[PDB]
Design a protein around this ligand. Structure first.
Ligand SMILES: Nc1ncnc2c1ncn2[C@@H]1O[C@H](C[C@@H](N)CC[C@H](N)C(=O)O)[C@@H](O)[C@H]1O
Length: 265
């Protein structure tokens, strides 16, 4: 019905929605870790596919979790919503990974897989024109999913996140041992309910990647994490609201992007 208690994240969202463009502009990257993408923009302008520049900021995002042991890509990796291929190409550089298969929607308003020759590119298959929500599940050892379309209405993000979770349940049952699944809106009620069930069935925990922008509450359900989900989410909302109410902003902390090298494996 209506009149239910609200989570601390719902008010971060309501607050965010009442920010001016200027406040939004100054807040979204204040205090976050940001990768220097200048060289990657030149490599893109020049069609340089052997310089080791990732196709997106998603690569550095996944490296952060992998280097910290939150997810151990290995064997056969499937990448639902691969977009340009940032996660897929990064995984192909890992020793334990044997094969990477990426699926992405593509078309109008959606990113297309990019052809690159980063290290291990021969192990990467990226397919556009695949709506993962209608694809029958396949066997894999590592399941990755980064699908989360933002919206100003939390009820819309909520229904979208539950959709993603119900879908990965089909793929997790095909022998997956390691996973990393994006949770676009982890503070909504129907999401916390589905997440609690999903954690019970498959383990893992919710982490926040500091390279994420303050303009979103997205978190990642990774098999290498653990802990009460509510506390995990609330810690993030608390962090986000402290950053929103700052006046003196420091801007992002810049660090160097991932280098993917080149050559076949
Ligand atoms: N039902 C869907 N099926 C397949 N792909 C989708 C679907 N919905 C959204 N997408 C795409 O999934 C992608 C999500 C991206 N965040 C992927 C980022 C990627 N991990 C990277 O590092 O570059 C978007 O490009 C969407 O076009």
């Amino acid at each position: 019905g209506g009149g239910r208690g609200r989570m601390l994240g719902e008010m971060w969202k309501a607050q965010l929605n009442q920010l001016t463009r200027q406040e939004f502009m100054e807040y979204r990257r204040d205090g976050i870790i940001e990768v220097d993408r200048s060289a990657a923009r030149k490599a893109r302008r020049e069609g340089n596919v052997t310089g080791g520049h990732p196709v997106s900021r998603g690569t550095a995002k996944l490296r952060w979790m992998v280097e910290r042991g939150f997810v151990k890509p290995h064997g056969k990796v499937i990448d639902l919503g691969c977009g340009r291929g940032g996660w897929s190409y990064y995984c192909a550089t890992l020793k334990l990974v044997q094969e990477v298969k990426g699926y992405t929607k593509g078309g109008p308003g959606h990113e297309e897989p990019v052809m690159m020759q980063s290290y291990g590119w021969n192990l990467v298959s990226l397919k556009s024109g695949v709506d993962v929500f209608y694809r029958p599940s396949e066997q894999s050892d590592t399941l990755l999913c980064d699908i989360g379309e933002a919206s100003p209405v939390p009820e819309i993000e909520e229904a979208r996140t539950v959709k993603v979770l119900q879908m990965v349940e089909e793929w997790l049952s095909r022998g997956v041992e390691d996973f990393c699944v994006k949770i676009l809106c982890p503070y909504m009620p129907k999401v916390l309910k589905e997440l609690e069930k999903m954690q019970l069935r498959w383990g893992g925990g919710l982490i926040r990647v500091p390279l994420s922008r303050n303009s979103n509450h997205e978190m990642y359900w990774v098999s290498g994490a653990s802990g009460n989900i509510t506390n995990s989410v609330n810690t993030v909302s608390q962090m986000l609201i402290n950053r929103m109410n700052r006046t003196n902003r420091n801007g992002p902390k810049y660090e160097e992007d991932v280098h993917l090298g080149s050559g076949t494996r």
